[PDB]
Amino acid sequence: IVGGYTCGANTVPYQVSLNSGYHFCGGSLINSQWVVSAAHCYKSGIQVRLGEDNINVVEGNEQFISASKSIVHPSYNSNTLNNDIMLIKLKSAASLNSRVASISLPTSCASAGTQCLISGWGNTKSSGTSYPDVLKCLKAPILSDSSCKSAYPGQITSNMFCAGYLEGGKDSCQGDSGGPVVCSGKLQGIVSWGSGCAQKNKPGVYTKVCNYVSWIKQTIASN
C-alpha cells in the first residue's frame, strides 16, 4: 500500500496473507472455510495466515491453515486479467473471533464515488521497494466508468473497476494483490492490477466482486 496508514492490529479481521515461505498475496475471509483472492495469485503450496498484523513475528491471534483447494475462475485470462478471482478452501475451518472474521459479499454493486477500504502488506513505495511488517490501510473512492476507461482504454472489462486517486501518491501495489476492497461492510473489490503504483492518472484496477456472487456461492456449495 502506497500513501496509506498503519491499520492497527486486527482492525481488518477479514484480511488474510497467502504464504509460501513468504508473503506473496492478500485475500479475504468470506466464511470459516473459504477465502477470496485473485486468480493471478494462484500457486501450489498455499498456506493461509489469518489474524495477522506483524507478518514477520508471531504475536498471538494467528491461525496458519493450509489450503485444501484453490479454484481459479475457469474463464480467468492471464493476458487481460478478466475474471481475476480465485476461491481457496481451508484444510480446516478457521476459528472465528473478534480478530478473525468474515467479510460480507455484496448484494448490489457499488457506485462511483463510493469510499472503500483497501489493505495489504504490499510495497509502500511508488518507486523502489519497502515492504512493511504490519498491515497498511488506504481509503479510496471508486472511480467512474469513463474515468476508468479513459485511464486504460480498451483494457477495462465489465468485471473491472478503478478505485483510487488520479493525482498520484495513493494506491495498492505489489504484495497487495488478491486483497480486499471493502465498501460499507461489503467486499466489492479484489486487488488486481495497475500501471506501476500511485502514478498520476494510473489508478488501481480491481475485480468487480458483485459480478461473482452467484459463481462464488455455487462454487462453494459444490465443493
Ligand X SMILES: N=C(N)c1ccc([C@H]2[C@H]3C(=O)N(Cc4ccc5c(c4)OCO5)[C@@H](Cc4ccccc4)[C@H]3[C@@H]3CCCN32)cc1
Q: Where are the beta strands (DSSP E) in 105-176?
A: 115-120, 136-141, 160-163
Q: Using CB under 6 A as the criterion, what x/- string covers residues 124-163 for binding ligand X? A: -------------------------------x--------
Question: Of these residues, 28, 37, 119, 177, which one is catalytic?
Answer: 177
Does position 172 interact with ligand X (CB under 6 A)? The reply is: yes
Task: Choose among 4, 209, 2: nearest CA to 86.
Answer: 209
Residue 33 binds: one of Ca ion, ligand X, none (C-beta under 5 to 8 A by kind)? none
Q: What angle do CA 192, 190, 42 make, to 5 degrees?
A: 65
What's the rounded Cα separation, in Å, for the pair 147 and 166?
A: 9
> Is residue 54 a contact residue for Ca ion (CB under 5 A)?
yes
Instruction: For ligand X, give the closer residue by CB, 85 or 191.
Output: 191
Dist. CA 4–CA 169, nearest whole Å:
9
Q: Catalytic residue among 23, 37, 40, 119, which?
A: 40
Residue 32 labeled ligand binder? no
Cα–Cα distance list, 217 to 105, 106, 211, 214 (Å): 10, 12, 12, 5
Q: Which residues are catalytic?
A: 40, 84, 177
Interface positions with ligand X (CB under 6 A): 40, 80-81, 155, 171-174, 177, 191, 193-194, 197, 204
